[PDB]
Each structure stands twice: as C-alpha cells, then as structure tokens.
Design an enzyme around this catalytic site. Structure first.
Site, short mmCIF file in Angstrom:
data_model
loop_
_atom_site.label_atom_id
_atom_site.label_comp_id
_atom_site.label_asym_id
_atom_site.label_seq_id
_atom_site.Cartn_x
_atom_site.Cartn_y
_atom_site.Cartn_z
CE1 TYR A 43 5.85 11.81 4.31
CE2 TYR A 43 7.71 13.10 3.49
CZ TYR A 43 6.37 13.00 3.81
OH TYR A 43 5.54 14.10 3.64
CB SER A 116 7.60 17.92 0.16
OG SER A 116 6.23 18.00 0.54
CE1 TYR A 117 7.77 17.17 8.78
CE2 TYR A 117 5.54 17.77 8.09
CZ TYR A 117 6.47 17.53 9.10
OH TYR A 117 6.09 17.65 10.42
CD1 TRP A 165 1.80 14.94 3.70
CD2 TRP A 165 0.83 15.34 5.67
NE1 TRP A 165 2.80 15.08 4.63
CE2 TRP A 165 2.23 15.34 5.85
CE3 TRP A 165 0.01 15.57 6.78
CZ2 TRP A 165 2.83 15.56 7.10
CZ3 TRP A 165 0.61 15.79 8.02
CH2 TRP A 165 2.00 15.78 8.17
CG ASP A 258 5.10 21.78 -5.62
OD1 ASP A 258 5.23 20.55 -5.54
OD2 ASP A 258 5.25 22.54 -4.64
CG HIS A 286 4.34 17.78 -3.98
ND1 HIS A 286 5.10 18.93 -3.82
CD2 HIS A 286 4.45 17.10 -2.82
CE1 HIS A 286 5.65 18.93 -2.62
NE2 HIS A 286 5.26 17.84 -1.99
#
Ligand SMILES: [Cl-]
Ligand SMILES: [Cl-]
Ligand SMILES: [Cl-]
Ligand SMILES: [Cl-]
Ligand SMILES: [Cl-]
Ligand SMILES: [Cl-]
Ligand SMILES: [Cl-]
Ligand SMILES: [Cl-]
Ligand SMILES: [Cl-]
Ligand SMILES: [Cl-]
Ligand SMILES: [Cl-]
Ligand SMILES: [Cl-]
Lengths: 574, 574
Positions: A43, A116-117, A165, A258, A286
C-alpha cells in the site's frame, strides 16, 4: 547523536531473478551496525500514516537505535516486476532479509512487524530459514490463506473480503502504473462503485464473471474463485504445517471482530511450545480499532493502545534482537480484552488453562423460528424429540450484520441483530435471563443435527449477548458448507432427508454475559455477503446464475437422540 | 540526494524569557537553504501518527524539499516552562518563527499547517507580523476562542468541549511531568472516567467545582468557567478583529459537523479580500473524518482525502513560499462536499454568489409539540396568530445527538433525531414531502418570537433532513442564551411574559434535500451537554446547584404579527 536519524528513499534491492524492489531506510545515528526491523507493504511504503495507526509508533524504535526498512511489494508503487498476491512473498522476503543482513549498518539481528497483509508476509518470511531473523510480530494475520481471509474453516467463500480487497488493490495497481491510460479514470469510478456497495457487487451472478476485477487482477478468479476446495493450489501458499517446526519468537495481535481472528489465534497455539510467543487480543474489527461502535461502546481503554503496543514491541525486540534477557520482565504471555466487564486482563496461556468446554443444548416448546419463538439453551439435554424447519432461498439470504466483516460494513463488529429477528429462516435459542455472570473465553463451536431437501446447503451459527434494553449484540459466528462437512479437500454431496451431525467452527470470543443478560444462539443457512450464498444444487456455486439455484427446506433436529448444542468455553473466576 | 532527509530530535529553541521549547527538525538533503513549514503541537511532537491522518501526508513535503519543524508547546512533553492554553502562543510562535528564519537551512520563506489546536496556533502566529511567514493552512480552527470552541455566538458554554479537552490535556500534563507522583495513577483513572462519560461529568452541580480538572489545569475555571460574558479576558486572546488587516494567504479546512465550523468559515470571509484564501469543507466531525456514521453514510469519496489534501497544500506552498506563479492553476477557490447528492463541488466564493436567503415560516394547526404535532414550514407567512408552549426543566434537558459535539459522542454528526421526537419540549415544524430538490448551502440562522415565565432561559433551533425511511438526520444547530440576545459583552435580563424577537446563529451547512425528503426544524430550550443548561434564574449559571434552578414555561409565537422563521441559504442550479 542518540535519538537522531536519516531517511533514504527508493533504495533498489535486487531479487534472485534480477527484479528490484524499492525500500525506504530509516537509520539511526550510530557508530556501528544496529538491529533492523522490516515491513513488507503493498500500500505504498511512502504512505506510512495509512497503516501505522493500526500498529505501533515505530519511529520510537528508530529513536531508540533500530533501523527500519519499509518495502513496496513486487509490482506495486516504486517496485519493479509484476504483482500477484502471496505467490512471490516467500522468495522476495528471503532475498530482502539476505540483502539487509549483508549491509554495513545491520548487526545480524533482524525482526518484522506490521498489520494484515504486513502480518501475513511475516509468516512467509519466517519459514524461509534465514537465521538472522530473530523475531516477528504479525498483527491481524494468517498462516493459512484458505482459512483466512479468502474462504474459511467451513468451506464458504468470503466474498465481501475478496471483492473489497481486490477493488482496494486494483486502485493501487492503477495508481502504480507505467503511464496513465485513457480507461484509468472510468476504472477508478467502477472500483469506487464496488467499495461503496460491496453487497451489490457480490450479488451479481455468475459470481465468477468479474469484467473489471478479473482484468485488473486475474488472480481474483484464476486462484480464488476457481478453487473452492482447499486443494493443492492453496497448500502451496499455506505456511501453517511449517509453523510447528519453527523456533521463531512471535508477538501475535488479533481482534475479536477481525476477519483473521481464528487464524491469528491458531498461529499462537502452533508456535507457543517451541519459542517465546505472546498474544494480545482487543475487541476490534479490521477497519475499526476505536472501541466505539453504533450500538456498543467498550470504553476508552478498548481503543487500540498504540503507545502500550509500542512499548511491548520494543521490549520484545530488545529481548530477542538485542539479547537483553530481562527485557520482558513483568510482561504477560497473554493479554485479552474481556468484553462485558470491558476490561483488559492478563493470562498465562491461550486457550486458557481451566477452560470448561460446556455443551449448551438447543430446546424449547414449539418452533424456534424468529426471536419470539420458543427456542431455549440449557446445560441439560432436551427431553423431547423436536425439529425446527425453514425455507432457505438464495434470492433472499440473511444479511450480514457485524461479526468479522472486512470491507462490507466492516466497522460495526458488535452489531445489534434485532433487524433480522422477525425472519422465519433465523432460528433463535436463548437461556433464561442470567442472575449471575457467565464468562465465555476461548474457541467456540457448534454441533448440529441437520437435514435438507437439497444435495448441498449451508448452516450458520452465531453467538449473541442479549442486553437488558433488548440489544442483541453479535459475538462470534461460523458456517459449514455441507459438501465440506467432513473435509475441505475432498467434498461429497449429501442425501436429501438424511440427518447429519455437523461441526460449525465459530472462531473465538471473550465475553462475560452479565446478570440481566441472556446467552443467545442464531441458526440459519446464509450470512451474506460475509459468505457467498449456497445455490442448494451441488453445482459449482460461483458459476451459477441466480435463476439456476434452488430453494431448500432445511431442518435442525433437537432432543435426546439428536442433542444439537453449542460448545462454550466456560471460565469460572471466584 | 533528492527525496532523502534527516531528523534531529529535541533541538531546544530559546524564547524571549529564556524558556526553551523542544522541536524536531525534518530537513531535506539539499545544497542550500530551503523553505520551511512549522507545526505547533500540545500532543507530543514525537507522536506524529495521532494527528497527521487528519491533515496531510506531510513527509511528501520533506521528500519534495521543504524542511518541517514540529514543536512541543510550552510546558508540555519535552518543552520547558509552564502550560496555560492560548496565552503564550502568540509570543512563542513569534520567537519560534524568528529562530527558524535565522537558521542556515531556512531560505527566508516559512509556512504553517495542521489541525484543531495546531490550526488555532497558526492565526496566533499570523498576527505577529513576522514578514517571513508567507502562508498558513489552518484546519478545523478558530480565530475567536469564545465563539469556538469554549462558548459560542449564542452565549452558552460548550461544556462537553471544555471538560473533554481538559481531561485529554490533563492526561498529557501528567505524562509530561518532572517525576512520577503517587497520585498520578488515581488521577489517570479519574480522567478516564470523565472521557468515558462526559455528559455525567457535565451534570455535576455546581459546574464550577472541578476538584480534579481545576487542580490539573486551573485555567479551566479561572478563565473559561468564570468568564461567561465575552469580556476583556476573551478579547485579549481573540485574533479575529486583527484578521481584516492581514495579507497572509490561508488554506482553510472545515467540517460540517466540526465544533469549529462557524469560526473556521468566518476566518475565510475575513481574509479573502486581502490575500489568496482557499476553502475546503467536508462532512466530518472532529473525531470522525471517515464519512461513515451510525445512520448516515456519505460514500468513499467523503473520507478525508489525505493525498488530494497533500497535493493541494504542496501546490499552495509552492505558490506562496517558492514563488511558482502557476502552481495553483486549475485549483478551485472553494471546494465543498455537498451532502444529499453526496458529491464534492467547486465554487468561486463563500458565501456562494447567488445565495437566496429565504425565510421559511413556522406554522400549523394545533400544537407543534413532538414530531406528531401539527408544525409546518412554508415560504408563506402563517395566516393565524398561534403559540406553542412547553415546560423546560433543567433537571431533564434535551440530550445532544450529533451536530458539532467534540468529545461527548463526537463521532456521529449526522445523527438520527427520532430518539427525542416524542418529547413535549421538542417543537417540530416540517415542509410537505418534497417533489423536487431544494439545495441549502451557506450560513443558517433563525428569527424567533419568544416569551418565558423566567428572567433568563435558552432557545435552540436545529435543521434536520427527514429521509423517506423516517430517519431524521441532523444538519446544523445553534442556541441563544436570552441574557445575551442583544450582546455577548453586556448581558441584560428579560421580563417574564414579554415577547422578544431573537436571532439564533445556526452555523452553516451544505445539503440538497432530495425528492421524498422533508426540511424540518426542531425548536427547544436545551441541548445538553453540547451546551450547558440554563438555570432559568438569571444567576451565575456555573455556580448554581441543580436544586437552586427553576423550571420555565417557554413559548414560541407564530403568525402574521410574529413571523418566526428559519432563514435558509437557497441555491438553485439548473
Ligand atoms: Cl549510505
Ligand atoms: Cl496489462
Ligand atoms: Cl454499550
Ligand atoms: Cl482495562
Ligand atoms: Cl416431515
Ligand atoms: Cl437419525
Ligand atoms: Cl546541524
Ligand atoms: Cl503542581
Ligand atoms: Cl445513508
Ligand atoms: Cl464526489
Ligand atoms: Cl396564556
Ligand atoms: Cl408583541
């Protein structure tokens, strides 16, 4: 000078195939090499404000003498190459970790952190066997991508997660590109339309026909939608079976609402015996770490405690990267936000030692359909052989409200369930009003005796805290897709009318149901768009038109010979 | 190297009195001096993540060749001295700006940016006359501290704002201190108790007795609570009258549900004629920039557009600090998020040229009490002489729901008003269901003919968009405290039973009321804890016990000779 640092932007790091990834280096003023922390980010490494408020005040790490490296993943933003989710991250992390270890400014000790990622990439890095990686800190993460975030333990596609996503990453892929295209402007509008209305996007049949998303990110169909079984394509990117043989310390963070929660907690259980594992779980979703929701407020202490998290991460890295043996003195192994009492509490293990896995049986006089039906929950087996029956129509699924939604209304985990309580396909079972508190802290599951008119269908179960004022607050839920009742790998169909005993994995919670409250369970056959809708045909669900789908008459059996129940992890603290 | 920079922490800057303030210097890699941006911050300069997500991705400024200076305000965190709000900031800013201008790395051009308190300090800096200050960018800010955030144009204390902010700063003051005290732990608990329950904290009488807050920050009582009139103590810290003679470019940001909105917009109007002023207004509250609320969602485009804001700030500073004459080409003067249509729109001025200030008169058959009463709004004067009457009891005020709340439930600006609609002291007046859209964009006010049984009381007015599904969404509101009906400086009491024509300043909005909606106005005599409750005695309100207060029978007069109305800024765009 202590506390001072420099930042070098777009340092290009060669991977084994010659593709170069862009990193930013935050390096302290020091007279020798330093320990190093790596963050792998799809990101934009430049955009630190976007994710950091969900993690740590990590500039404190730099001020304290750690270097921090933030990387653009392959094929995004300043990095070279082509982007495909998950598949390159093991190798790219290994090559990135190797490069860092070779640098003049690295003392041979590397760690990772991020959310997260930025958490999933840490498990991928940890299985690489790079000795210089001394610790990781995966927040809101998973080591099994089928089980979270794309499908689940019950074998249903997490459709809102996938489409949301994909639209988010799609927006990044356009922004990242070689040179602006004439169709970029219209593509942005369409991606925005998906993000404003994820349930609408998820409602189009066949699900697998995604003109925009399939063009921008072919993986969305080629891997995710096209592989509904937990088959060899999924095991390839799965890390979980490799976790048991690791000896890497891990600071694991999760949220009760989450999307990754079940898998985050599983990773703690998988590594705790062989290395220093830590666990922190708050009441977050999230996209909402505030502790404030539409119909439920957890108090200011519930707000993601970023300075406490920063202090704990630093102590953890001090212990494992700087060899300071006393650095984690006084730090608990496990720290949970216990809802209901709405307090943080220290524990020695997860699952809690002294968890009593207690069946609460479904019962009642007359139909349990709707919240005004006769459905009961009791620690005693039901005396009479009964059944509750409903019609599940794929054209009218039960709407998702709260829970572990990621992108479709993902900011209201503890959602009031009253808006769906007058529905005939929502079966409700509740205890009496409680005179004394009941704590439920641990993994949660249901065992139901079920039958269907169809050769495949879904069953859902949802745990709910009913407040004195009538609010019916969601706690945790799961699904079983019947073809996957026995196995996610090799599905088989069911016979119409036959009774099956099935397990539903309802993830986990920590809640004290206080005096004046009720424990309540909702049972149904859909929860959309958290999960895609079963077509009730036995077909390839994602390839079916709505008009090709069938309704199903579904039945929950309850009594002495079919003791359907929820298993609650009961904690008693006197 | 372009894009690279260094960070020097805790550089100590001497003020005229010898007290040193701590700054962090973010300085680009460059071969000469550079333009410089200053941020003055009472919430720890180290903690950049806390405020920056509400402002700009300002590291892009550094990567683009600006230096950024972030300062701890006097008496907080790493700075020396003693902290008192507002009073030292003009001088400290002047001395800080002077120091920056003297440094080797500054090219003689300085600007400022930042939000809330980081915005107010910019007006204080701009009136100092430092020639090297070329531009400011105050977001969610005020140049008149009485009018926002502490009191208001109607002369009522913004009690939730005062207590919440004091508790927040109090938490900072303890964290900042010389050495930990035994009472610190208990003080933190009590501050947390205030922040979890601001309405409760505001409910204690006398209001002026604040054992904890008054001890931690004496100013809360000595200045704010003790000075209810807009007297000489307030004018001292007020900048507004000085704004008309400035020629400093200002990039002004506001939110429709932000506590500072009326004052933010006023600053634009005050400076626009003498310098390049810009305006950006989104549908945000002070603690919710997401565009998502409990009963109202504005779309993803409504989310605070941090990269667009960053691009615009950089273009603005490029124009005014770097003399790039074409830098703001294509940038609008005014950009508003127009609610209802829920779209951003460019304008040439604020107020909009071609605003039709249109009276909508209060009318109806029978009592307008409650939402099921007969109250109407119409562009025609009412034909019959009527009056609506209610009892206002200070022990039972109308609760605040949405609007411009800061700390007490300040994350739900566009709140559904239905929970208060069956109250007898809430008078409701609405148009017919609209067949065609009506746009209301600009400042909003009401003129009411009122009478009371008391020698002082309040009147409130609130504009509301009634949706087809019944949601009654708050847009903007205000209050008049009757002793201040003519002047905030020299109050006088009213005679019981006498009719007064009074103005209520309802701040501003931008909303298209779409077909199927109604325009609705709520009238009452309280809105608590957004505003403190009038005691109906004519006494010193903050010094009165609840039991010393009186009820009031209040009356709204409407008809040909008493044409009570709301003035709506009507925009017609064909
Ligand atoms: Cl170097
Ligand atoms: Cl392509
Ligand atoms: Cl609550
Ligand atoms: Cl707590
Ligand atoms: Cl039957
Ligand atoms: Cl059987
Ligand atoms: Cl220097
Ligand atoms: Cl003191
Ligand atoms: Cl809406
Ligand atoms: Cl727009
Ligand atoms: Cl009368
Ligand atoms: Cl009169």
């Amino acid at each position: 000078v202590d506390g001072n640092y420099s930042v070098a932007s777009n340092v290009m790091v060669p991977m084994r195939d010659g593709v170069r990834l862009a990193v930013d280096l935050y390096r302290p003023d020091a007279d020798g090499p330093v320990p190093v922390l790596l963050v792998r980010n799809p990101y934009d490494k430049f955009d630190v404000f976007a994710w950091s408020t969900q993690s740590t005040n990590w500039l404190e790490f730099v001020r304290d003498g750690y270097a921090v490296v933030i990387q653009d993943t392959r094929g995004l933003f300043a990095s070279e190459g082509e982007f495909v989710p998950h598949v390159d991250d093991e190798a790219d992390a290994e090559d990135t970790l190797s490069w860092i270890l070779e640098q003049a400014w690295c003392d041979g000790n590397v760690g990772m952190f991020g959310v997260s990622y930025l958490g999933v990439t840490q498990w991928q890095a940890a299985v690489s066997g790079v000795g210089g990686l001394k610790a990781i800190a995966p927040s809101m993460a998973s080591a099994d991508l089928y089980r979270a975030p794309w499908y689940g333990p019950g074998g249903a596609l997490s459709v809102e997660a996938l489409l949301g996503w994909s639209a988010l990453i799609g927006t990044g892929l356009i922004t990242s590109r070689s040179d602006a295209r004439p169709e970029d402007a219209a593509d942005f509008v369409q991606l925005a339309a998906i993000l404003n209305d994820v349930a609408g996007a998820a409602s189009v049949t066949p699900l697998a026909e995604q003109p925009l998303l399939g063009r921008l990110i072919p993986w969305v169909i080629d891997q995710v939608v096209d592989h509904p079984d937990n088959d060899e394509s999924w095991q390839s990117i799965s890390l979980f079976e490799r976790l048991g043989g690791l000896a890497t310390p891990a600071l694991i963070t999760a949220g009760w609402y989450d999307g990754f929660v079940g898998e985050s907690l599983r990773t703690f259980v998988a590594v705790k015996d062989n290395a220093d594992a830590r666990l922190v779980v708050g009441p977050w979703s999230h996209s909402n770490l505030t502790g404030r929701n539409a119909d439920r407020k957890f108090g200011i202490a519930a707000t993601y405690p970023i300075q406490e998290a920063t202090t704990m991460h630093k102590a953890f890295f001090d212990r494992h990267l700087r060899g300071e043996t006393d650095a984690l003195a006084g730090v608990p192994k496990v720290r949970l936000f216990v809802m209901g009492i709405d307090e943080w509490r220290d524990e020695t293990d997860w699952p809690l030692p002294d968890t009593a896995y207690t069946p609460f049986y479904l019962g009642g006089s007359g139909a349990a359909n709707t919240s005004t039906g006769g459905g009961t929950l009791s620690t005693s087996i039901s005396g009479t052989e009964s059944a509750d029956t409903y019609l599940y129509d794929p054209a009218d699924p039960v709407p998702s409200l709260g829970g572990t939604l990621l992108f479709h209304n993902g900011d209201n985990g503890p959602a009031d369930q009253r808006p769906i309580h007058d529905r005939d396909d929502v079966l409700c079972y509740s205890t009496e009003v409680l005179t004394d508190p009941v704590e439920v802290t641990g993994t949660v599951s249901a065992r139901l005796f079920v039958s269907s008119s169809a050769v495949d269908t879904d069953f859902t179960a949802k745990l709910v805290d009913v407040f004195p004022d009538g609010r019916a607050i969601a706690l945790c839920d799961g699904i079983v897709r019947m073809r996957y009742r026995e196995t996610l790998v090799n599905p088989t169909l069911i016979e119409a009318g036959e009774i099956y005993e099935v397990a539903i994995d309802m993830l986990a919670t920590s809640n004290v149901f206080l005096p004046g409250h009720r424990i309540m369970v909702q049972v149904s056959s859909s929860n959309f768009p958290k999960y895609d809708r079963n077509s009730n045909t036995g077909g390839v669900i994602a390839r079916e038109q709505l008009e090709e789908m069938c309704t199903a008459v579904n039945r929950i059996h309850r009594g002495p010979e079919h003791p359907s129940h929820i298993v609650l992890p009961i904690i008693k603290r006197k």
